[PDB]
Amino acid sequence: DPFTMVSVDNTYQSLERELANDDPWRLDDNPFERERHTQLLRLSLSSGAVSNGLEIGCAAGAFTEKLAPHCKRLTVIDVMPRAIGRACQRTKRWSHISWAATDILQFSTAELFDLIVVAEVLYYLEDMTQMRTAIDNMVKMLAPGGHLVFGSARDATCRRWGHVAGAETVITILTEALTEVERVQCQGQSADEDCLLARFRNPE
């Protein structure tokens, strides 16, 4: 069925607009987003407590808040300063969270993480060369036994949203460097609410 979304000149403005909503991306108020988060957290916790976690793309901190109590240390990156601002207010009781306003394309640490969560973010990149670059970066920052928990709207949905690729395409690329340990589908009320999540292990 046909649908309507806000229309902007670039991805920065798209992000900035959602981050100015009371509930960005409806991540608090949408039962589908809550169920997605349940799956995302179930996958993240599959191996128990995390030593050094990374969250890539935090919106207003809805998932950060669910993840934080289970990581000894948590780092959170987001290309939008407004996302860091909203999320760190949400998680203020925790003293073990670090933040950086950076694009995943530009993020370079010597840090290795035993969990990287990358959900509903990689389709904002402009093309497949950027996705690969970001994926290589994520693979590089995985600890020798660590897991990567990925989630995304499907390819078709992503293409309807004006983006280049979604879940199936990224899973394919992820699989060249990493070992798939599990996956889950997540479906809501419409074609737009149809998500694939997969948990990958670093064969290392």
Ligand X SMILES: Nc1ncnc2c1ncn2[C@@H]1O[C@H](CSCC[C@H](N)C(=O)O)[C@@H](O)[C@H]1O
**Which H or E run contains 201?**
strand 194-201
- Given a contact cutoff of 8 angstroms between Cβ atoms, the answer to whether 60 and 95 are in contact is no
- What's the CA gap between 202 and 181, in Å, rounded? 10
Question: Which of helix, strand or coil describes residue 174?
Answer: helix
Supply the minimum distance, in Å, between the C-beta of residue 19 and ligand X: 7
| 15 near ligand X, rule: CB under 6 A | yes
Q: Which residue has the tokens 């039962």?
A: 31
**What SS3 class is residue 119?**
strand
Q: Determine if 78 is a binding residue for ligand X (CB under 6 A).
A: yes
Number of residues in contact with ligand X under rule CB under 6 A: 21
The pairing of strands 50-56 and 71-78 is parallel
Does the protein bind ligand X through residue 195 (CB under 6 A)? no
Among 43, 50, 83, 116, binds ligand X (CB under 6 A): 83
Residue 27 makes contact with ligand X by CB under 6 A:
yes
- Contact range with ligand X by CB under 6 A, out of 46-54, 71-79, 161-169, 179-187: 71-79
Q: Cβ(26)–Cβ(59) under 8 Å?
A: no
> Out of 97, 120, 149, 155, which residue is the one contacting ligand X (CB under 6 A)?
120
- Reading the block at residue 102, the tokens are 């950076």
CB closer to ligand X out of 1 and 9: 9
Token pair of 204 as six digits: 């290392």
Q: Pick from 68, 116, 119, 165: which binds ligand X (CB under 6 A)?
A: 119
Q: Does 57 bind ligand X (CB under 6 A)?
A: yes
Is the Cβ–Cβ distance between 187 and 150 less than 8 Å?
Answer: no
Considering only 67, 68, 71, 77, the residue that binds ligand X (CB under 6 A) is 77
Q: Which residues contact ligand X (rule: CB under 6 A)?
A: 15, 25, 27, 56-59, 62-63, 77-80, 83, 103-104, 119-121, 124-125
